[PDB]
Design a protein around this ligand. Structure first.
Ligand SMILES: OC[C@H]1O[C@@H](O[C@H]2[C@H](O)[C@@H](O)[C@H](O[C@H]3[C@H](O)[C@@H](O)[C@H](O[C@H]4[C@H](O)[C@@H](O)[C@H](O)O[C@@H]4CO)O[C@@H]3CO)O[C@@H]2CO)[C@H](O)[C@@H](O)[C@@H]1O
Length: 377
C-alpha cells in the first residue's frame, strides 16, 4: 500500500496524507513553485550560476511554500548525466554526480523543510515539449518503462506526492486536422494512440503498480474532440495542458482516490490570448473561461484539481495587463477554494514569465509576489 508508510489519496476534492502506522489522516494543501531546469541540457534547476541551492529552498519556504514541482526530462533521470553551467565556488556540496542526485538531494532538503515534491515528466527531449508522450525514436513503452524506473528511486521519498504523467500534451497543427492527423494529443476522439485520456490510464496504471501510495496528476490537452471544443466559445483557445473540458464525458479510467486533474493556465506574457482584450471582456470575462476550461472539474464534478503551472509577472519585464490577470486569478482561486497550485516559475529566466523573483537571482517581484501570498493567506 506504501513502502514509505505515507499513503497519499484523494477524498472528496481534497488531498489527504495518511500515516498508515499512526493512523493520522491529514488534509494537505499545496502552495507550490516550479523549480525548473531539470528538463534541460544543463541538467539542473536554474539560477545556480548565481547562488546556493538551499538558499533557494530556504528562500522559497520562508516566503510561505510547502511544495515544489520538479520538471525533468529522460536524460536527467538516467544515471550518468552531467549537469552544466553551475558555480561550484558557491555550491561545493555535491561532488561528481548525476543530475539525478542534485535532484534527489534537492528533494531531500525540501522535505526536511516539510516541502512536498511533485515529479513531472516534462520533456522526452531536453529541447522542447513534444506534443505527445512518444516520438519516432522514443516509444510509449519506453516512456512508461522510464516512468516505472522513476517511480522506484523517487518513490521512497516520503514528501513525493505523485507523478505529473506528461507535461503539457498539445497539438502542433490546427483543427480539424489536429484531431485526426496523429501529430498531436486528443481527448475523447477515439484513437487510443492520441487520446490522452486513454494513454493516461495506461501510464498511470503502470505507475500505481510500482507506487500505489502515489497520486496520479493528469494535465489537460490543448484540443480534445471537435464536439467538445466547439461546445464553448473559447473552446479552441485553451492552453497547452489546460483543456479539461472533456473530463465530464471522457473521465480518465483510474481510481478516483488516486487521481488529480492538473490544468495549466497563463496570462498575457506567455501568449496573447484573444479573450485578453477589453473588446472581448478582459478581465471580468475571466471567471467563466477558467470555469469552462477546467474550473468545473472541481466545482461541479468534485474531482481534486491542482493548478500545475501558472505564472508571469504583474509587471515590466514586459506587459502590464498581466497585473490585472494574475490579480483576478488569485481572487478567483480564493473565491472558489482552489488552494492547491504550483507557480511558474521560481526561475527568473522564463523569457515569458520570469521566476518569482528577478534576474539577479536574488530579489523577488514584491507586488507580483504580494498578490500570490493572499491565497496561502
Ligand atoms: O522549461 C524551461 C523553459 O521554460 C520555458 O517556458 C515555456 C513554458 O514552461 C511552457 O509552458 C510554454 O508553453 C506555451 C508555449 O510557449 C506557447 O507558444 C503556447 O501558446 C499557445 C497557446 O497556449 C494556445 O492557447 C494557442 O491556441 O496556441 C498557442 C501557440 O500558437 O502556450 C504554451 C503554454 O500553454 O512555453 C514556454 C517557452 O516558450 C521558458 O521560456 C524557458 O526560458 C525555460 O528554459
Amino acid at each position: 500500500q506504501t513502502p514509505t508508510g505515507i499513503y497519499y489519496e484523494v477524498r472528496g476534492d481534497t488531498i489527504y496524507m495518511i500515516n498508515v502506522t499512526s493512523g493520522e489522516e491529514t488534509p494537505i494543501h499545496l502552495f507550490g513553485v516550479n523549480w525548473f531546469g531539470f528538463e534541460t541540457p544543463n541538467h539542473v534547476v536554474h539560477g545556480l550560476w548565481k547562488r546556493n541551492w538551499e538558499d533557494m529552498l530556504l528562500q522559497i519556504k520562508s516566503l510561505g511554500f510547502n511544495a515544489i514541482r520538479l520538471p525533468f526530462c529522460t536524460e536527467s533521470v538516467k544515471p550518468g548525466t552531467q549537469p552544466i553551467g553551475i558555480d561550484y565556488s558557491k555550491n561545493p556540496d555535491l561532488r561528481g554526480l548525476d543530475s539525478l542526485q542534485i535532484m534527489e538531494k534537492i528533494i531531500k532538503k525540501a522535505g526536511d523543510l516539510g516541502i512536498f515534491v511533485l515529479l513531472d515528466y516534462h520533456r522526452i527531449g531536453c529541447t522542447h515539449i513534444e506534443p505527445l508522450w512518444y516520438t519516432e525514436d522514443f516509444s510509449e513503452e519506453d516512456f512508461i518503462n522510464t516512468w516505472i524506473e522513476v517511480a522506484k528511486r523517487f518513490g521512497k521519498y516520503w514528501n513525493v506526492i505523485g507523478a505529473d504523467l506528461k507535461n503539457e500534451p498539445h497539438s502542433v497543427t490546427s483543427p480539424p486536422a489536429a484531431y485526426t492527423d496523429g501529430t498531436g494529443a486528443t481527448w475523447g476522439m477515439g484513437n487510443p494512440a492520441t487520446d490522452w485520456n486513454l494513454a493516461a490510464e495506461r501510464i498511470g496504471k503502470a505507475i500505481l503498480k510500482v507506487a500505489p501510495h502515489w497520486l496520479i496528476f493528469v494535465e489537460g490537452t490543448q484540443f480534445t474532440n471537435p464536439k467538445t471544443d466547439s461546445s464553448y466559445k473559447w473552446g479552441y483557445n485553451a492552453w497547452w495542458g489546460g483543456n479539461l473540458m472533456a473530463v465530464k464525458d471522457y473521465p480518465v479510467n483510474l481510481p478516483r482516490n488516486k487521481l488529480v486533474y492538473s490544468p495549466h493556465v497563463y496570462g498575457p506574457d506567455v501568449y496573447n490570448q484573444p479573450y485578453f482584450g477589453p473588446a472581448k471582456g478582459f478581465p471580468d470575462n475571466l471567471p467563466d473561461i477558467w470555469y469552462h476550461h477546467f474550473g468545473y472539474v472541481k466545482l461541479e464534478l468534485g474531482y481534486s484539481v491542482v493548478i500545475g503551472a501558472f505564472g508571469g509577472k504583474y509587471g515590466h519585464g514586459g506587459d502590464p495587463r498581466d497585473v490585472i490577470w494574475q490579480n483576478k486569478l488569485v481572487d478567483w482561486m480564493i473565491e472558489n477554494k482552489f488552494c492547491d497550485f504550483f507557480y511558474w516559475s521560481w526561475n527568473p529566466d522564463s523569457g515569458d514569465t520570469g521566476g518569482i523573483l528577478q534576474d539577479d537571482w536574488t530579489t523577488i517581484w514584491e507586488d507580483k509576489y504580494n498578490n500570490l501570498k493572499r491565497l496561502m493567506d
